[PDB]
Amino acid sequence: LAQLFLQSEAAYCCVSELGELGKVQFRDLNPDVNVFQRKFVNEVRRCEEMDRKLRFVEKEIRKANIPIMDTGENPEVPFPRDMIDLEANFEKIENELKEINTNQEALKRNFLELTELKFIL
Amino acid sequence: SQTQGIQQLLQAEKRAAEKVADARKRKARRLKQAKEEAQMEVEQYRREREQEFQSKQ
Amino acid sequence: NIIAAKAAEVRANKVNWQSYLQGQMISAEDCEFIQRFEMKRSSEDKQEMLQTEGSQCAKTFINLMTHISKEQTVQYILTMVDDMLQENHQRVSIFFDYAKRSKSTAWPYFLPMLNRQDPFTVHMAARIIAKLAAWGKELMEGSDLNYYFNWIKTQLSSSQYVQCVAGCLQLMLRVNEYRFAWVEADGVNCIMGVLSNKCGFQLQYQMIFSIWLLAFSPQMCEHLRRYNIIPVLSDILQESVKEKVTRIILAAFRNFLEKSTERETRQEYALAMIQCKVLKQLENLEQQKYDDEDISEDIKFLLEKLGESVQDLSSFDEYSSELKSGRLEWSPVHKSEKFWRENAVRLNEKNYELLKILTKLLEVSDDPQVLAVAAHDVGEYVRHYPRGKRVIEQLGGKQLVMNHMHHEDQQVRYNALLAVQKLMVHN
Amino acid sequence: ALSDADVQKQIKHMMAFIEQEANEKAEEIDAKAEEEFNIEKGRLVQTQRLKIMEYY
Amino acid sequence: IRVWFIKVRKMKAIYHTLNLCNIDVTQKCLIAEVWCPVTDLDSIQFALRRGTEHSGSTVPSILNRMQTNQTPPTYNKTNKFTHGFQNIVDAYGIGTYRE
DSSP string, chain E: -HHHHHHHHHHHHHHHHHHSSB--SS-SSEEEEEE--GGGHHHHHHHHHHHHHHSTT-------B---SS---------STTHHHHHHHHHH----TT-
How many residues comprise chain C?
427
Q: A77 in helix, strand or coil?
A: coil
Q: After which residues does chain E break, using C–N > 2.5 Å?
A: none
Interchain contact A2–E (C-beta under 8 A): yes
Of the candidates C197, C233, C200, C201, the one whose C-alpha atom is nearest the C-alpha of residue C215 is C233
Judged by DSSP in three states, C266 sits in: helix
Taking each helix axis as running N to C, give the angle between helix C2-12 and helix C71-87, from 0 to 180 degrees, rounded to the nearest 10. 110
- What is the rounded distance in angstroms from the CA atom of residue C379 to the CA atom of residue C415? 8
Q: Which residue in C244, C252, C186 sits closest to C216, CA to CA?
A: C252
Burial class (CB within 10 angstroms; exposed 0-12, middle 13-18, buried 19+) of C297: exposed
Query: In Å, how far are A105, A109, A118, C401 from A112, measured between CA atoms?
Result: 10, 5, 10, 24
Helix axes C230-238, C278-287, angle to 10 degrees: 40
Task: Specify the pairing of strand A25-27 against strand A2-6.
Answer: unpaired
Residue among D1, B5, C242, A20 nearest E31 (CA): B5
Contact D45, B38 (CB under 8 A): yes
Q: Is C368 within 8 Å of C353 (Cβ atoms)? A: no
Tell me A25's DSSP state: E
C-alpha separations of A8 from A11, C166, C242, E75 in Å? 5, 27, 10, 31
Q: What are phi and psi of A30, to 5 degrees?
A: -130, 65
Phi/psi for B5 (5° steps) reads: -60, -20
Cα–Cα distance for residue pair C322/C326, rounded to 1 Å: 7
**Residue A41, SS3?**
helix
Q: Which residues of B touch E27 (CB under 8 A)?
A: 8
CA atoms within 13 A on the CB side of A117: 7
Best mutation target among C180, C204, C210, C244 (most D Cβ atoms within 10 Å) is: C244
- Strand segments, DSSP code E, in C318-416 are none
Q: How does D13-30 read in b/e, with b if 16+ C-beta sit within 10 Å?
A: bbeebeeeebebbebbbb
Q: Quick check: E54 contacting C, CB < 8 Å?
A: no
3-state secondary structure of A12: helix
Long-range contacts of C283-290 (CB under 8 A, 24+ apart): C284/A84, C285/C246, C287/A42, C288/A39, C288/A42, C288/A43, C289/A39, C290/C243
| Residue A18, Cβ density class (10 Å: 0-12 exposed, 13-18 middle, ≥19 buried) | buried
Tell me the sheet residues that pair with A5. Answer: E31
Chain D residue with Cα closest to E29: D14
**DSSP code for A32:** T
State the greatest distance between any 2 C-alpha atoms of chain E, in Å, as a whole number. 49
CA distance linking residue C182 with residue C170, whole number of Å: 12
- Show Cβ contacts of residue C260 under 8 Å, excluding neighbours closer than 6 positions: C218, C266
Task: Report d(CA B32, CA C394) in Å as an integer.
Answer: 76
CA gap D10, D7 in Å, rounded: 5
Residue of B nearest to E63 (CA): B1
Question: Touching check for D37 and chain B: CB below 8 Å?
Answer: yes
Contacts (Cβ under 8 Å, ≥6 apart) of A19:
E13, E14, E17
| Cα first-last separation, chain C | 75
Helices C176-184 & C159-173 angle (0-180, nearest 10): 120
C44-60 in b/e form (b: 16+ CB < 10 A) is ebeebbeebebeebbbb
Determine the distance from the C-alpha atom of residue E93 to the mean position of all C-alpha atoms in its chain, rounded to a whole number: 24
What is the spatial distance between Cα E59 and Cα E1, in angstroms, rounded to a whole number? 35
Kindly state the helix (H) or strand (E) to which residue B21 belongs, with its residue range: helix B4-56
CB neighbourhood size of C230 (10 A): 21
C contacts of A9 (beta carbons < 8 Å) = 241-242
Query: Which residues lie closer than 8 Å to B1 by C-beta, 6 or more apart?
Result: D7, E64
Chains C and B touch (3+ CB pairs under 8 A): no
DSSP single-letter state for residue A26: E
Subunits touching D (CB < 8 Å, at least 3 pairs)? B, C, E
Q: What is the rounded (10 degree) CA torsion for C219, C220, C223, C226?
A: -120
Residues of E in contact with C201 (CB under 8 A): 56-57
Helices (H), C216-262: 218-224, 230-238, 245-258
- Identity of residue D11: I
| Residues of chain B neighbouring D11 (CB-CB closer than 8 A) | 4, 8
- How far apart CA A48 and CA A26 sit, in angstroms, is 23
> What is the secondary structure of C112-180 as a DSSP string?
T-S--TTTTHHHHHHHHT-SSSSSS---S-SIIIIISTTTHHHH---HHHHHHHHHHHHHHHTSHHHHH
Contact at CB, B4 and D22, closer than 8 angstroms: no
Q: At what angle do helices A8-21 and E2-19 cross, to 10 degrees?
A: 120
Give whole-number Cα distances, A104 to A66, A109, A116, C232, E86, in Å: 19, 9, 18, 42, 58
User: Which residue pairs from A86-94 have beta carbons closer than 8 angstroms and sit at least 24 positions apart in sequence?
Assistant: A87/A50, A87/A53, A87/E4, A87/E8, A88/C280, A90/A50, A90/A53, A90/A57, A90/E4, A91/A53, A93/A57, A94/A53, A94/A56, A94/A57, A94/A60
Q: Of the candidates C51, C32, C31, which has an alpha carbon nearest to the alpha carbon of residue C43? A: C51
CB contact burial E80-93 (16+ within 10 A = b; e otherwise): eeeeeeeeeeeeee
> Which parts of C259-343 fold into alpha helices (H)?
263-275, 278-287, 293-312, 316-324, 337-341
| Residue C291 DSSP label | S
Q: Are C332 and C372 in contact (CB under 8 A)?
A: no
Which contacts qualify for C360-363: CB closer than 8 Å, 24 or more apart? C362/C397, C362/C400, C362/C401, C362/C404, C363/C400
Q: Which amino acid is at C70?
A: K
Report the gap between the CA of E13 and the closest CA in chain D (Å): 29
**Alpha-carbon distances, residue D21 vs B4, C205, D13 (angstroms):** 18, 12, 13
Name the residue in chain E with its Cα closest to that of D18.
Answer: E27
Residues A27/E33, Cβ–Cβ less than 8 Å:
yes
Rounded Cα–Cα distance for residues A94 and E4 (Å): 14
Q: Is A50 helix (H, G, I), strand (E, B) or coil?
A: helix
Sheet containing A2-6: order of strands: A2-6, E30-35, A25-27
